[PDB]
Amino acid sequence: SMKLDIKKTFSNRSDRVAGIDFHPTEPWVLTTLYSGRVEIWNYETQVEVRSIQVTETPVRAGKFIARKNWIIVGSDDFRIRVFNYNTGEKVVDFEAHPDYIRSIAVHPTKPYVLSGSDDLTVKLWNWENNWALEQTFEGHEHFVMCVAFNPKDPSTFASGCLDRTVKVWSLGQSTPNFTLTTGQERGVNYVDYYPLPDKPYMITASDDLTIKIWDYQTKSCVATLEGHMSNVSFAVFHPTLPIIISGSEDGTLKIWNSSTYKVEKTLNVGLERSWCIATHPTGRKNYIASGFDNGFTVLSLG
């Protein structure tokens, strides 16, 4: 067991941060900004590794593809771009959807990337097939806000949608395995998987102020977490600690106990609205990072 002991590792002021991600083996965080800029920071030495003026439009989605030394970003010009973060070379640059890109997910073992879009679809791209579009998942009836592979079975993934559903799909299958009606009448902003095999759980966040935990075997709602006072931008399970982290346009991060679902901490990090979240994939120092209107902060949770 490990006690909560929150330490501010690194904080950096900037334009609004829309996407944020951890590098799995370097002490780096990637941020994608509403200004069209993206930055990689070493949060342990507090040194900027690289910055790129990618576009003039907001860059909403960004992920490391560490095993190719890439970052992949999606922006409101409808385009996916890939950059080598060691050289700055632009690897590819294509219009992926005819509308905004909301979310990007990277398959852990196969050369697949998912993009969720306001065009009501999720699309699957294969970078070992010249970034071919291998599948478009159709069936949602509003903007697809968030996509996430099941870490315990990456042949499936979940899409959260403003049509108030989460759909779980299988690669190569045109119809979803199942559709969760969330009861979150304002729609689903975010979806995330519980990482460990002891619970088949998922978590959703909504503008209706609720965070809901779902059992994807029983398709039932396990718990509803209330406490935020404005739109909940995200909610995720921590990969190694028994906690949930959420962030809201009310300016706060909340840390919840993942067994009792009681709020343990409410943090005003002082950067106004909270928009995005990342956790270190292997729990290194239990790092988390969140992007806000006015920058991002990296915290060690214990």
Numbering used by the authors: 0 to 301
Quote the paper.
Hence, this loss of critical proteins has the potential to compromise ER proteostasis and generate cellular stress. This challenge to normal metabolism is overcome by the activity of the cytosolic coatomer protein I (COPI) polymer, whose repeating unit is the coatomer, a 560 kDa complex of seven distinct gene products (α-, β-, β′-, γ-, δ-, ε-, and ζ-COPI)25–31. Overall, the coatomer functions to retrieve the escaped “client” proteins, such as type I membrane proteins, from cis-Golgi back to ER by retrograde trafficking. In particular, the S protein – a type I membrane protein – is delivered to the ERGIC from both the ER (by anterograde trafficking) and the Golgi (by retrograde trafficking)3,10–12. Here we utilize recombinant SARS-CoV-2 S proteins and tail peptides, including constructs with enhanced mimicry of the coatomer binding motif (clientized S protein), to elucidate the atomic structure of the S-coatomer interface.
We hypothesized that if the interaction site is comparable between the αWD40 and β‘WD40 domains, then a disruptive substitution at a juxtaposed critical WD40 residue should yield a similar weakening of S tail interaction with either domain. Therefore, we expressed and purified an alanine substitution mutant of β‘WD40 Lys17, which is juxtaposed with αWD40 Lys15. This β‘WD40 mutant demonstrated a lack of binding to the clientized Thr1273Glu S tail heptapeptide, which is consistent with the loss of binding displayed by the αWD40 Lys15Ala mutant. Next, we determined a 2 Å resolution crystal structure of this domain. This showed a rotation of the Arg15 side-chain reminiscent of the conformational change reported above in the αWD40 Lys15Ala mutant.
